[PDB]
Amino acid sequence: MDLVKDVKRELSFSELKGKRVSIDGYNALYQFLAAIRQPPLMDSQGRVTSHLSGLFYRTINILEEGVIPIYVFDGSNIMVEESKKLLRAMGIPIVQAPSEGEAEAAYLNKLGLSWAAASQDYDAILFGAKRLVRNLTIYVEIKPELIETEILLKKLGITREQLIDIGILIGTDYNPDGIRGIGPERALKIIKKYGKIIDEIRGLFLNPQVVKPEALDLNEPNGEDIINILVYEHNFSEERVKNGIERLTKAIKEAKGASRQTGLDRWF
Amino acid sequence: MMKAKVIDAVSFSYILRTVGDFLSEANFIVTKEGIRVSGIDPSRVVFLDIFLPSSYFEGFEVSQEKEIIGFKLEDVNDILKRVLKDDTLILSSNESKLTLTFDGEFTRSFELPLIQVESTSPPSVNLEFPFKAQLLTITFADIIDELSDLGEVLNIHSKENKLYFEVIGDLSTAKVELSTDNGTLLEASGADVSSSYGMEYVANTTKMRRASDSMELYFGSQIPLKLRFKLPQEGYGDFYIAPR
Amino acid sequence: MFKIVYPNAKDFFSFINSITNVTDSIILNFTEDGIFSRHLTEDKVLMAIMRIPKDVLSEYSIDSPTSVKLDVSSVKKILSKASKATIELTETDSGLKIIIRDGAKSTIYIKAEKGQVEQLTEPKVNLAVNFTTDESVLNVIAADVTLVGEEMRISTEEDKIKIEAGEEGKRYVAFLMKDKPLKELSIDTSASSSYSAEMFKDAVKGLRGFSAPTMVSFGENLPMKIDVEAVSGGHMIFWIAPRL
Ligand SMILES: [Mg+2]
Ligand SMILES: [Mg+2]
Ligand SMILES: [Mg+2]
Ligand SMILES: [Mg+2]
Ligand SMILES: [Zn+2]
Ligand SMILES: [Zn+2]
Ligand SMILES: [Zn+2]
Ligand SMILES: [Zn+2]
């Protein structure tokens, strides 16, 4: 565990309909690389095409539900680039982060340009994300999961500065494994009593390198660029795409529509 | 610019609904003499020639010598599927749009952008058939809609002025006798062809029942099956089907 | 404990079936003022409200306003499993009993969790435009719009109501006016508003089962309220949130 200091509620796609979501590019890709395997999914030339299968099949699944997806990349690097070239060709908005993708994903949410950051990891919270949605990328039916920072901080009775310090005691990427022999629960207790007495690591979370985007809108998906990186170079089956690329653009009509939708609760 | 008002909009609907079983795209070729819709299907087995005279319409005008209105059939058919019982359809067209308006309890019109579609017709007929038969469209639609289950191929023939509709299915072949001494045929002449046809092609013309009271049937050995569904006010819906 | 009597069981079932178009799990509220039911979809786009004022009921006997959550699907599916008659609600230890007296008589027992009476939180806004018409008119338009696009645009146009839909060059236009077909029309100010075509269809679809007319009301970039008063006195309402 890295964060199990959570009581969080699941959310139906109903509540998520008509919402821009700051999906982490890198996190999404690994998930797609680690999940779907038909016979890693290979092609004719003998390379992994599993990243593309996710970006194609799951993103339509997302758009058909009403979620406007924004993939955020930071910086094989060619796998990432040919993931971007697909997303440009699909029309789905793309944002290049100055350093940390999830920090940018948090910042887009913080600017009100996204409703929430989406990742399987919790790092977005520590970068100032208002909300974190899990399980978009991936009895036990896996439903979307929502963590609200405002509700989290109130229930644990801490501030954002404090959660960062707890993150330090648990372990971030800047301090992998954190302080040994202190877990989440012990970290929470410690900071709830004091305030940490790495002095730079705080600054990497509080105020990291992020950009105002300058975008972020759904464009028309053209096939003359989609087929080139899917059906040929990385060898996909066009038979599936014909009925799939067709529902892609068809999903945009309902997705961009839902974006304009007002809530009946602004007249209560 | 073209304007044509159709009183029996539901009937009109069934004409175009048939064409849609054969064609995905067609032209309304509107002239001072009337409105023509024709074309060949992708498999090249069926050519259809449907003419609706100016008198078929309740008030009809065309500003030019000829006007070509290109439309996707399923789009027009879906619109036409929204017709009400008491409604009257009015077709108009301008520089860019084809408009279909239903007028009844209230007015509601649908617009579709003009489409470019190849008017190749033809290319089929210089034909004289050895056998011709007149019958009510209703009874034709009974025989075919109840025979359409069995067989990919409808093999019909004539003998002693009597017209026999045979289909060879999985277990046994069932045949239907149509004659004037029977009650199903009105008039018939000629001798003595035996041909077979693609069952799906014939069965797809049966909705013309809802648009035509009587019809003519022309056939011959080695030559096309011509169905001429007589339409109101001297109109006609021609369907040539190539032989198997 | 309670006793409620409604003079018309036909309309009672209609209310239940109407809310079912939204939640399939109804929750009635027995207040001092009467009965109501209010479900708000998880997207907060659409809201169904049933309200039957106390004076409209044959008998209304309570002492304490309570809530009754009908045992989700199963129970609300046992109700609509029943069919001119009166209907009676009475309290059981673990739910409620229903008597349908027609001089026939039937009783279906329902297990239902009881609780604290809820609020009737409803959009607080002024709609400058409203009109009355049949349900059939509303159904026609609803089917017409969803056929053409995802979005509907209702607006005032001189002494007419103009309904529009259309995605890419292919549009739909409908005109509604006094006597054609509107029963009554009131335009306080010019108003234009866009709504999800599907959402309009769902709301309209949930208003069949009443011979009574239907009031539709909107404003400039405001929610649309559509309601029917049942012949016996109740009120079924649908609110639809606009697009901006
Ligand atoms: Mg990261
Ligand atoms: Mg470790
Ligand atoms: Mg004559
Ligand atoms: Mg409810
Ligand atoms: Zn992870
Ligand atoms: Zn002979
Ligand atoms: Zn619906
Ligand atoms: Zn009232």
Coordinates of N, CA and C in Angstrom, one line a residue, chain C residues 65-166:
Chain C
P65 N -46.1 12.5 9.5 CA -45.6 12.3 8.1 C -44.4 11.4 8.1
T66 N -44.5 10.3 7.3 CA -43.4 9.3 7.1 C -43.1 9.1 5.7
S67 N -42.0 8.4 5.4 CA -41.6 8.0 4.1 C -41.7 6.5 4.0
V68 N -42.1 6.1 2.7 CA -42.2 4.6 2.4 C -41.3 4.3 1.2
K69 N -40.2 3.6 1.4 CA -39.4 3.1 0.3 C -39.9 1.8 -0.2
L70 N -40.5 1.7 -1.3 CA -41.0 0.5 -1.9 C -39.9 -0.5 -2.2
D71 N -39.9 -1.7 -1.6 CA -38.8 -2.7 -1.6 C -38.2 -2.8 -3.0
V72 N -37.4 -1.8 -3.4 CA -36.8 -1.7 -4.8 C -37.7 -2.2 -5.9
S73 N -37.1 -2.9 -6.8 CA -37.7 -3.3 -8.1 C -38.9 -4.3 -7.9
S74 N -38.7 -5.4 -7.2 CA -39.7 -6.5 -7.0 C -41.0 -5.9 -6.6
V75 N -41.1 -5.2 -5.6 CA -42.3 -4.6 -5.0 C -43.0 -3.7 -6.0
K76 N -42.3 -2.7 -6.6 CA -42.8 -1.8 -7.5 C -43.2 -2.5 -8.9
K77 N -42.7 -3.7 -9.0 CA -43.1 -4.6 -10.1 C -44.3 -5.5 -9.8
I78 N -44.6 -5.6 -8.6 CA -45.8 -6.3 -8.1 C -47.0 -5.4 -8.3
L79 N -46.8 -4.1 -8.1 CA -47.9 -3.1 -8.3 C -48.3 -3.0 -9.7
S80 N -47.4 -2.7 -10.6 CA -47.7 -2.6 -12.0 C -48.2 -3.9 -12.7
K81 N -48.1 -5.0 -11.9 CA -48.7 -6.3 -12.3 C -50.2 -6.3 -12.2
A82 N -50.8 -5.3 -11.5 CA -52.2 -5.2 -11.4 C -52.8 -4.2 -12.4
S83 N -54.0 -4.4 -12.8 CA -54.7 -3.6 -13.9 C -54.7 -2.1 -13.7
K84 N -62.3 0.8 -14.3 CA -62.6 1.9 -13.4 C -62.8 1.4 -11.9
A85 N -61.9 1.8 -11.1 CA -61.9 1.4 -9.7 C -61.2 2.4 -8.8
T86 N -61.4 2.2 -7.5 CA -60.7 3.0 -6.4 C -59.5 2.2 -5.9
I87 N -58.6 2.9 -5.2 CA -57.4 2.2 -4.6 C -57.1 2.8 -3.2
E88 N -56.8 1.9 -2.3 CA -56.6 2.2 -0.9 C -55.2 1.8 -0.4
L89 N -54.5 2.7 0.3 CA -53.2 2.4 0.9 C -53.4 2.3 2.4
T90 N -52.8 1.3 3.0 CA -52.9 1.1 4.5 C -51.6 0.5 5.0
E91 N -51.3 0.8 6.3 CA -50.0 0.4 6.9 C -50.0 -1.0 7.4
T92 N -48.9 -1.7 7.1 CA -48.6 -3.0 7.7 C -47.4 -2.8 8.6
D93 N -47.1 -3.8 9.5 CA -46.0 -3.7 10.4 C -44.6 -3.7 9.6
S94 N -44.6 -4.4 8.4 CA -43.4 -4.5 7.6 C -43.5 -3.8 6.2
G95 N -44.6 -3.1 6.0 CA -44.8 -2.4 4.7 C -46.1 -1.7 4.6
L96 N -46.8 -2.1 3.5 CA -48.2 -1.6 3.3 C -49.1 -2.6 2.6
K97 N -50.4 -2.4 2.7 CA -51.4 -3.2 2.0 C -52.2 -2.3 1.0
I98 N -52.5 -2.9 -0.1 CA -53.3 -2.2 -1.2 C -54.6 -2.9 -1.4
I99 N -55.7 -2.1 -1.5 CA -57.0 -2.6 -1.8 C -57.5 -2.0 -3.1
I100 N -57.8 -2.8 -4.1 CA -58.4 -2.3 -5.3 C -59.8 -2.8 -5.4
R101 N -60.8 -1.8 -5.2 CA -62.2 -2.2 -5.1 C -62.9 -1.7 -6.4
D102 N -63.3 -2.7 -7.2 CA -64.0 -2.4 -8.5 C -65.5 -2.9 -8.4
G103 N -68.6 -5.6 -8.2 CA -68.0 -5.1 -7.0 C -66.8 -5.9 -6.5
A104 N -65.8 -6.1 -7.4 CA -64.6 -6.9 -7.2 C -63.7 -6.3 -6.1
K105 N -62.8 -7.1 -5.6 CA -61.8 -6.7 -4.6 C -60.6 -7.5 -4.6
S106 N -59.4 -6.9 -4.6 CA -58.1 -7.5 -4.5 C -57.1 -6.8 -3.6
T107 N -56.2 -7.6 -3.0 CA -55.2 -7.0 -2.0 C -53.9 -7.6 -2.3
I108 N -52.9 -6.7 -2.5 CA -51.5 -7.2 -2.6 C -50.7 -6.5 -1.5
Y109 N -50.0 -7.4 -0.7 CA -49.2 -6.9 0.4 C -47.8 -6.6 -0.1
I110 N -47.3 -5.5 0.4 CA -45.9 -5.0 0.0 C -45.1 -4.8 1.2
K111 N -43.9 -5.4 1.2 CA -42.8 -5.1 2.2 C -42.1 -3.8 1.8
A112 N -42.1 -2.9 2.7 CA -41.5 -1.6 2.4 C -40.9 -1.0 3.6
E113 N -39.6 -0.5 3.5 CA -38.9 0.2 4.5 C -39.5 1.6 4.7
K114 N -39.8 1.9 5.9 CA -40.4 3.2 6.3 C -39.3 4.1 6.8
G115 N -39.4 5.4 6.7 CA -38.4 6.4 7.1 C -38.9 7.8 7.3
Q116 N -38.0 8.7 7.3 CA -38.2 10.1 7.5 C -38.6 10.8 6.3
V117 N -39.8 11.5 6.3 CA -40.3 12.3 5.2 C -39.2 13.2 4.6
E118 N -39.2 13.3 3.3 CA -38.1 14.1 2.6 C -38.6 15.4 2.0
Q119 N -37.7 16.2 1.5 CA -38.0 17.5 0.9 C -38.4 17.4 -0.6
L120 N -39.3 18.3 -1.0 CA -39.7 18.4 -2.4 C -38.9 19.5 -3.1
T121 N -37.6 19.4 -3.1 CA -36.7 20.4 -3.7 C -36.9 20.4 -5.2
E122 N -37.3 21.6 -5.7 CA -37.8 21.7 -7.1 C -37.2 23.0 -7.7
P123 N -36.7 23.0 -8.9 CA -36.3 24.2 -9.6 C -37.1 25.4 -9.3
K124 N -36.5 26.5 -8.8 CA -37.2 27.8 -8.5 C -36.9 28.8 -9.6
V125 N -37.7 28.8 -10.6 CA -37.5 29.6 -11.8 C -38.8 30.0 -12.4
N126 N -38.8 31.1 -13.2 CA -40.0 31.6 -13.9 C -39.9 31.3 -15.4
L127 N -40.8 30.5 -15.9 CA -40.9 30.2 -17.4 C -41.9 31.2 -18.1
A128 N -41.3 32.0 -19.0 CA -42.1 33.0 -19.7 C -43.0 32.4 -20.7
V129 N -42.7 31.2 -21.2 CA -43.4 30.5 -22.2 C -44.0 29.2 -21.8
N130 N -45.3 29.0 -22.1 CA -45.9 27.7 -21.8 C -47.1 27.5 -22.8
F131 N -47.4 26.2 -23.1 CA -48.5 25.8 -24.0 C -49.0 24.4 -23.6
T132 N -50.3 24.2 -24.0 CA -51.0 22.9 -23.7 C -51.3 22.2 -25.0
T133 N -51.1 20.9 -25.0 CA -51.5 20.0 -26.2 C -51.7 18.5 -25.8
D134 N -52.1 17.7 -26.7 CA -52.2 16.3 -26.5 C -50.9 15.6 -26.2
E135 N -50.9 14.3 -25.9 CA -49.7 13.5 -25.7 C -49.2 13.0 -27.0
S136 N -50.1 12.7 -28.0 CA -49.7 12.2 -29.3 C -48.8 13.2 -30.0
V137 N -49.2 14.5 -30.0 CA -48.3 15.6 -30.5 C -46.9 15.5 -30.0
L138 N -46.8 15.4 -28.6 CA -45.6 15.3 -27.9 C -44.7 14.1 -28.3
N139 N -45.4 13.0 -28.5 CA -44.7 11.7 -28.9 C -44.2 11.8 -30.3
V140 N -45.0 12.4 -31.2 CA -44.5 12.6 -32.6 C -43.2 13.4 -32.7
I141 N -43.3 14.6 -32.1 CA -42.1 15.5 -32.1 C -40.9 14.8 -31.4
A142 N -41.1 14.1 -30.3 CA -40.1 13.4 -29.6 C -39.4 12.3 -30.5
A143 N -40.1 11.6 -31.2 CA -39.6 10.6 -32.1 C -38.9 11.3 -33.3
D144 N -39.5 12.4 -33.8 CA -38.9 13.1 -35.0 C -37.6 13.7 -34.7
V145 N -37.4 14.2 -33.5 CA -36.1 14.9 -33.1 C -35.0 13.9 -32.9
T146 N -35.3 12.9 -32.1 CA -34.2 11.9 -31.8 C -33.8 11.1 -33.1
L147 N -34.6 11.1 -34.1 CA -34.3 10.5 -35.4 C -33.3 11.3 -36.2
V148 N -33.3 12.7 -36.0 CA -32.5 13.6 -36.8 C -31.2 14.0 -36.1
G149 N -31.3 14.2 -34.7 CA -30.1 14.6 -34.0 C -30.1 14.2 -32.5
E150 N -29.1 14.7 -31.8 CA -29.0 14.5 -30.3 C -29.5 15.7 -29.5
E151 N -29.7 16.8 -30.2 CA -30.1 18.1 -29.5 C -31.3 18.7 -30.1
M152 N -32.2 19.2 -29.2 CA -33.5 19.8 -29.6 C -33.4 21.3 -29.3
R153 N -34.0 22.1 -30.1 CA -34.0 23.5 -29.8 C -35.5 24.1 -29.9
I154 N -36.1 24.4 -28.8 CA -37.4 25.0 -28.7 C -37.3 26.5 -28.6
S155 N -38.2 27.2 -29.3 CA -38.2 28.6 -29.3 C -39.5 29.3 -29.7
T156 N -39.7 30.5 -29.4 CA -40.8 31.3 -29.8 C -40.5 32.0 -31.1
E157 N -41.6 32.1 -31.9 CA -41.5 32.7 -33.2 C -42.8 33.4 -33.5
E158 N -42.9 34.7 -33.4 CA -44.1 35.5 -33.5 C -45.2 34.9 -32.6
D159 N -46.3 34.4 -33.1 CA -47.4 33.8 -32.4 C -47.3 32.3 -32.5
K160 N -46.1 31.7 -32.8 CA -45.9 30.3 -32.9 C -44.8 29.8 -32.0
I161 N -44.8 28.5 -31.8 CA -43.7 27.8 -31.1 C -43.0 27.0 -32.2
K162 N -41.6 27.2 -32.2 CA -40.8 26.6 -33.2 C -39.9 25.5 -32.6
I163 N -39.9 24.3 -33.1 CA -39.1 23.2 -32.6 C -38.1 22.8 -33.7
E164 N -36.9 22.8 -33.4 CA -35.8 22.5 -34.3 C -34.8 21.4 -33.8
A165 N -34.3 20.6 -34.8 CA -33.3 19.7 -34.5 C -32.5 19.6 -35.8
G166 N -31.3 18.9 -35.7 CA -30.5 18.8 -36.9 C -29.0 18.9 -36.7

